[PDB]
Amino acid sequence: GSHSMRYFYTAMSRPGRGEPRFIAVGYVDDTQFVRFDSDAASPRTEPRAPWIEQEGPEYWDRNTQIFKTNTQTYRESLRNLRGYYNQSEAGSHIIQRMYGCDLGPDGRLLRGHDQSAYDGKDYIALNEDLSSWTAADTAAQITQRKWEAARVAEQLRAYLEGLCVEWLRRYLENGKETLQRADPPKTHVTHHPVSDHEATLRCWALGFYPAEITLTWQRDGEDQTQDTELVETRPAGDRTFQKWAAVVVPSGEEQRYTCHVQHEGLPKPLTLRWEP
Amino acid sequence: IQRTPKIQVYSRHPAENGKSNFLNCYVSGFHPSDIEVDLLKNGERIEKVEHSDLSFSKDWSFYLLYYTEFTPTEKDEYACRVNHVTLSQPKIVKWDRDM
Amino acid sequence: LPAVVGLSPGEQEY
């Protein structure tokens, strides 16, 4: 019953191909609810979940104002960072930012987040105190000094402990039938001979929400961590997720192996075997 | 530093021949964000494909879902072709309904 | 709802 809200910003320069693109997306847990793309024919914040549609024009206008402003500021920031790293005007570079709030099952703030990266590398992060910064390198220390000078951390703390939590709680109520519903995985084991003396057992989890899940194989009751192939959790496109874990076993030993599934949607964790 | 995409090709629902479904190509773990993805049917690019809005994981790598309606048959072959700056040539991953 | 920081647009810069 814990919940989070996150915004994810991507700003990408593209010398010779116009001004840098800014994209913002917002999520509650594993559900996206808004987007903004400065490359759109008519850039505006758009709904991406049915429960946000009820927000009034003032909401959409305020969001759009914010993201249109951010489009311009992140363009300047990309120029600034290019300078901080003595980089050529010829290369494409990316700033990413992720920020938001985490609530525990009581609805209370657990912690806030605000982190940035440059070309995929940590650049600067707001510490858990919501009051101080961790800069990755001497360029980021320049940003730290600018942000210390401008009282940015104080404003982000006020947001994170205030509006962030308030709006997240509003979304959770408006979207309660989906955001506050855990869909358990549907699970089964398949068997695929690979040779005369070995076979693959693949443990499947399908149709689950949220994305967090644990799938493990045991042999004789011992986790088979080093010998398990585990694919990345993947979206089905209907809000739910899919995952599998596989192990190659000696033929005739299949019943020594058990698949174990943990998911919020399960009252009791599951143990499965191949059923021939 | 650049990161090359992971690629999974799979259906939304269990594949049943002659029953409409969605064909997914999920690309993840890549950096930078520019990426070309096409879904193929017997080697031919499928025309009307949609995709998710750009977002990224805790490690800053990007992910995107590309998807289209499809009706699997016994004989039709599906695949995802991905190009990215980390790749010397486009990578083709075939749809296997057991994966 | 997203964040709004900064003395001005300028103060939001990295």
Side-chain angles (χ1 to χ4, degrees), chain A residues 32 48 96 232 234-235, chain B residues 3 8 10 28 31 53 60:
Chain A
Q32 193 196 332
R48 301 291 279 157
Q96 286 156 274
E232 189 174 11
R234 71 199 191 186
Chain B
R3 285 176 263 173
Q8 296 191 68
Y10 57 99
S28 62
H31 205 109
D53 305 321
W60 310 102

Side-chain angles (χ1 to χ4, degrees), chain B:
Chain B
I1 301 297
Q2 306 187 317
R3 285 176 263 173
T4 204
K6 306 183 249 211
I7 304 156
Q8 296 191 68
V9 185
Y10 57 99
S11 57
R12 181 181 296 176
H13 301 296
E16 298 178 73
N17 288 335
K19 307 210 178 308
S20 187
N21 205 322
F22 279 82
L23 175 64
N24 289 329
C25 180
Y26 182 56
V27 289
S28 62
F30 59 97
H31 205 109
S33 51
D34 281 347
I35 192 165
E36 187 167 344
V37 179
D38 289 293
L39 299 174
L40 309 180
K41 172 173 175 158
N42 312 310
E44 264 50 83
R45 166 177 180 279
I46 301 168
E47 219 196 333
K48 256 178 184 145
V49 177
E50 297 172 277
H51 60 96
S52 60
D53 305 321
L54 189 64
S55 194
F56 54 84
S57 300
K58 282 160 45 179
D59 67 5
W60 310 102
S61 69
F62 295 103
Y63 63 82
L64 292 167
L65 182 64
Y66 285 74
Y67 55 101
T68 187
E69 296 196 44
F70 88 132
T71 307
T73 62
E74 160 169 354
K75 293 205 166 105
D76 287 314
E77 293 177 320
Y78 290 94
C80 184
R81 183 169 50 207
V82 180
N83 205 183
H84 187 256
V85 66
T86 56
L87 299 179
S88 300
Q89 74 205 53
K91 189 171 287 184
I92 296 168
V93 175
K94 301 172 139 171
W95 179 50
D96 177 345
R97 64 180 77 194
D98 302 337
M99 303 288 263

Side-chain angles (χ1 to χ4, degrees), chain A residues 36 68 96 129 131 164 166 183 196-197 204 208 225 256 264:
Chain A
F36 174 96
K68 278 175 163 169
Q96 286 156 274
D129 61 13
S131 302
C164 193
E166 294 165 30
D183 299 327
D196 282 1
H197 63 274
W204 283 93
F208 58 94
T225 308
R256 292 170 60 187
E264 178 185 341

Side-chain angles (χ1 to χ4, degrees), chain A residues 211-222:
Chain A
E212 176 57 50
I213 196 165
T214 313
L215 295 186
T216 60
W217 275 105
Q218 289 176 20
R219 174 188 171 111
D220 303 327
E222 194 201 332

Side-chain angles (χ1 to χ4, degrees), chain C residues 1-13:
Chain C
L1 182 81
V4 186
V5 182
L7 294 178
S8 163
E11 253 50 40
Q12 293 162 14
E13 292 180 17

Side-chain angles (χ1 to χ4, degrees), chain A residues 5-273:
Chain A
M5 182 161 72
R6 288 288 189 280
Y7 287 87
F8 299 90
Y9 298 171
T10 306
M12 178 192 7
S13 66
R14 44 185 174 188
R17 296 193 302 105
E19 290 297 329
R21 185 182 199 162
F22 177 88
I23 295 162
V25 297
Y27 281 74
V28 170
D29 304 321
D30 299 318
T31 300
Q32 193 196 332
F33 68 101
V34 175
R35 72 177 179 196
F36 174 96
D37 182 356
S38 64
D39 277 354
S42 210
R44 62 176 208 150
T45 312
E46 292 176 333
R48 301 291 279 157
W51 48 262
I52 200 65
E53 290 168 12
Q54 63 192 287
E55 300 295 342
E58 196 164 78
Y59 179 85
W60 301 102
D61 293 346
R62 182 54 174 144
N63 271 264
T64 295
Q65 177 168 53
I66 288 171
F67 296 138
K68 278 175 163 169
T69 299
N70 295 156
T71 298
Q72 300 308 130
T73 74
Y74 280 80
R75 295 179 171 164
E76 296 305 331
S77 299
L78 280 163
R79 291 176 169 213
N80 298 347
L81 267 66
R82 185 218 303 106
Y84 299 161
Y85 289 107
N86 312 297
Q87 284 166 341
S88 172
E89 283 160 14
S92 175
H93 297 277
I94 295 181
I95 291 171
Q96 286 156 274
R97 190 169 199 153
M98 45 186 173
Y99 66 88
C101 42
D102 298 345
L103 275 21
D106 41 26
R108 296 208 189 168
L109 180 70
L110 283 175
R111 80 160 285 172
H113 300 267
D114 172 61
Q115 295 170 263
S116 304
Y118 185 60
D119 292 335
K121 289 174 53 276
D122 289 24
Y123 182 79
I124 197 171
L126 186 62
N127 289 325
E128 193 172 6
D129 61 13
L130 310 184
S131 302
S132 58
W133 303 98
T134 296
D137 62 26
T138 50
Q141 290 169 16
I142 304 305
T143 297
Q144 179 172 337
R145 293 173 218 168
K146 280 177 146 166
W147 291 358
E148 278 169 355
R151 311 183 169 78
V152 172
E154 297 103 290
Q155 296 189 253
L156 294 180
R157 174 179 170 188
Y159 168 77
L160 290 167
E161 299 186 306
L163 288 170
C164 193
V165 169
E166 294 165 30
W167 281 93
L168 171 52
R169 296 203 284 238
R170 175 183 171 74
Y171 304 149
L172 293 168
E173 174 60 25
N174 292 348
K176 65 189 179 199
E177 297 181 2
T178 45
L179 298 173
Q180 296 187 68
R181 191 186 79 229
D183 299 327
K186 303 178 179 80
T187 57
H188 72 278
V189 176
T190 58
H191 181 276
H192 300 78
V194 313
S195 85
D196 282 1
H197 63 274
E198 286 184 322
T200 299
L201 297 179
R202 181 166 290 110
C203 189
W204 283 93
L206 297 172
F208 58 94
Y209 180 94
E212 176 57 50
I213 196 165
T214 313
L215 295 186
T216 60
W217 275 105
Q218 289 176 20
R219 174 188 171 111
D220 303 327
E222 194 201 332
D223 283 17
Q224 296 295 293
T225 308
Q226 306 314 277
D227 291 307
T228 302
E229 175 180 359
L230 195 64
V231 296
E232 189 174 11
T233 303
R234 71 199 191 186
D238 56 14
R239 106 181 192 111
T240 73
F241 298 87
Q242 310 180 343
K243 197 188 194 57
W244 60 251
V247 61
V248 177
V249 308
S251 293
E253 293 190 7
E254 290 85 351
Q255 297 307 311
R256 292 170 60 187
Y257 288 84
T258 53
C259 177
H260 299 270
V261 186
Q262 295 204 65
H263 180 85
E264 178 185 341
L266 296 175
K268 58 254 203 204
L270 299 168
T271 300
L272 290 81
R273 283 170 226 75

